[PDB]
Amino acid sequence: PGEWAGKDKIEKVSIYMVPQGGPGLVESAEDLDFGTYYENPTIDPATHNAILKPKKGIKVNSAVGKTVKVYVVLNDIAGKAKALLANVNAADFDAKFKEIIELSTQAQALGTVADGPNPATAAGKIAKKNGTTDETIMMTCLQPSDALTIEAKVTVERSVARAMVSTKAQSYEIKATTQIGEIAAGSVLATITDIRWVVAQGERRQYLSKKRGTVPENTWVTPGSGFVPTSSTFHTNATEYYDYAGLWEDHNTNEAVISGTQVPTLADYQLQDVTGELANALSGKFLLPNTHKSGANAASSDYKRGNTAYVLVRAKFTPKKEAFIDRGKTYSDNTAVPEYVAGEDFFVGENGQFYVSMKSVTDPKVGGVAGMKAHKYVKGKVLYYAWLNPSTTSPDSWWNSPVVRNNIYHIHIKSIKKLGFNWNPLVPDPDPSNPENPNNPDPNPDEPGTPVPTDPENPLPDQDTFMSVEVTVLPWKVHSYEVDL
Ligand SMILES: [Ca+2]
């Protein structure tokens, strides 16, 4: 990436002076205009941190003569720190600075079609892209200054993580691995085009500043860390913790078209002066942290498909007409099977074969099977999951995927290898007894009793991979900001 990993704007500075030793009065200087009170950042080439040096003194008022610790929030642009910390006693302040803020309500965590293409997301409320120029992101200190007496330095880290996605190519050729209609193993089966992405299941709340856990399997805890969904509790409780509004980003109401944000190539990241829309894709997407107890297997890892942040990749799968086992045949009712038309719905049976309709799927005269179910791919839409931080890599072993603030998770797609899923079960359904779900852009299009493509109670890894990807975790160019006082 390089220059696309973010350039920061500091708009506001909030300083909290907290007397030590027991009950007492906090002195706060909130939402100070950065330019008025601070010099422009200078980078420490050793640490890659930026240092903010004050120009103007802040009035210490009642804290004069006291031993205090200093806490800092930069860019409290949603007012969340101010509101949480209001009228908090000095004795309660350190604990309060680690308590929970809510970026989206449980109701706001679910969007609908009317919220596209630019839905408010939880993380976007405290991480703003200012045109293509720079970005304003909330930051808080993991720990306050050392104790000092008024007559030091406070390091802060960004409150969001960033997801970035790239692809080797904008099209992929798919080969059959077994006989599919007239297509032999090793021959071309389909082409994938029009690749897009969104991110979901980051959290909707967060600890104001990073909160250490109690066991080594989860260094930093998040409000949702203890939530381990079953197939049923996912639907009733997932929105208590996670944000899904982002599923509607760059949504398109034409089902012939693939919804979501473009996925740039590596070369796109080297282009100078870029369109607005591509610039937005290149700078990625923000999400709030999401961690669970890590383990070495399904039983010991608390990371589940229904509680882990994911990138959803969407694309157009165009199969060769010759792949259809029903091609050229005659139905049991003595009518002819129509050839597949590119871009139209297609149906993939439990047997892996391709059919132009459900009528074909269950008619043995055309290579169907009575009683057999199929996945309906709506106008050829296919879906794939990528986890943000597979720990470790790479196929059937990435049991864990923590997302921690102030990190960038770059997912590079090297290839899409096979047919994906036809809908996204990793979205809470307010009435799970029916397939309708206005909160999901990719609801279940299948007939009753069709096997689900995946389940929220499942572990992360795939037995055999749908995509080849490499994930890189990196810091912002400026790792953290140091505020001098
Ligand atoms: Ca439903």
Q: Is residue 329 part of a domain?
A: no
CB 150 within 8 A of CB 68: yes
Distance in Å, CA 341 to ligand 1 centroid? 30
Ligand 1: centre distance to CA 362 (Å): 26
Whole-number Å distance, alpha carbon 485 to ligand 1 midpoint, is 55
Is residue 335 in some structural domain? no
* Residue 291 forms part of a structural domain: yes
Q: Is the dihedral of CA 371, 372, 373, 374 positive or negative?
A: negative
Whether residues 191 and 295 share a domain: the answer is yes
Which residues constitute the domain of residue 444?
164-318+378-474
CA of 431 to the centre of ligand 1 (A): 4
Q: What distance in angstroms lies between residue 28's CA and the mean position of ligand 1's atoms?
A: 48
Question: How far is the centre of ligand 1, averaged over its atoms, from the C-alpha of 187 (Å)?
Answer: 39
- Which candidate, 393, 209, 270, 355, places its Cα nearest to that of 2? 270
Using the mean position of ligand 1's atoms as its centre, give its distance from the Cα of residue 121 in Å: 23
Strands 172-175 and 134-137: what pairing? unpaired
Residues 226, 274: one domain? yes
How many angstroms separate the alpha carbon of residue 255 from the centre of ligand 1? 19
Ligand 1 mean position, distance from CA 433 (Å): 6
CA dihedral 387→393→398→404, nearest 10 degrees, is: -50
Q: How many CA atoms lie within 13 A of 229 on its CB side?
A: 29
Distance in angstroms (rounded) separating the CA atoms of residues 11 and 30: 12
How many Å lie between the centroid of ligand 1 and the Cα of residue 246?
Answer: 19
Q: Ligand 1: distance of its center to the CA of 157 in Å?
A: 40
Rounded CA separation 167/269 (Å): 11
Are 230 and 112 contained in the same domain? no
Q: Alpha-carbon dihedral of residues 388, 391, 306, 103, nearest 10 degrees?
A: -50
Closest CA to 238 of 433, 461, 426, 421: 426
Give me ligand 1 centre to Cα 424, in Å: 13
- From residue 174, alpha-carbon distances to 29, 188, 193, 267, 359 in Å are 59, 6, 11, 23, 26
Instruction: State the distance from the centre of ligand 1 to the C-alpha of 4, rounded, in angstroms.
Output: 39
Resolution of the model in angstroms = 1.7
Do 292 and 403 fall into the same domain?
A: yes
The tally of domains found in the chain comes to 2
Q: 424 in a domain, yes or no?
A: yes
Domain match, 133 and 215 both: no
Separation of 315 CA from ligand 1 center, angstroms?
A: 24
Give a yes or no: residue 42 inside a domain: yes
In a domain, 366, yes or no: no
Cα 112 to ligand 1 centroid, rounded to whole Å: 13
According to the entry, how was the structure determined?
X-ray
Query: Distance, CA 444 to ligand 1 centroid (Å)?
Result: 9
d(CA 14, CA 30): 4
Give burial (CB, 10 Å; 0-12/13-18/19+) of 433: exposed
Kind plus residue range of the DSSP H or E element containing 84: helix 80-85
The reply to whether 240 and 130 lie within a common domain is no
Asked whether residue 142 falls in the same domain as residue 240, the answer is no
Q: Which residues contact 351 (CB under 8 A, 6 or more apart)?
A: 369, 372
Rounded to the nearest angstrom, the distance between the alpha carbon of 33 and the centre of ligand 1 is: 48
The Cα–Cα gap between 88 and 462 comes to 48
- What's the CA angle centered on 231, arms 357 and 301, to 5 degrees? 120
Clarify whether residues 227 and 118 are in a common domain: no
Question: Could you tell me if 151 and 171 lie in one domain?
Answer: no
Q: How far is the CA of 447 from the centre of ligand 1 (A)?
A: 13
CA–centroid distance, 436 to ligand 1, in Å, is 4
Separation of CA 399 and ligand 1 centre (Å): 29
Task: Indicate whether 127 and 196 sit together in one domain.
Answer: no
Same domain, 147 and 276: no
Rounded distance from Cα 434 to ligand 1 centre (Å): 4
The candidate with the shortest Cα–Cα distance to 405, out of 199, 45, 142, is: 142
Based on C-alpha coordinates, what's the Rg of the chain? 26
DSSP-derived secondary structure for 416-436: E-S--BSS---S--SSTTSS-
- Residue 359 inside a domain? The answer is no
Question: Does 178 map to a domain?
Answer: yes
**Same-domain pairing of 288 and 386:** yes
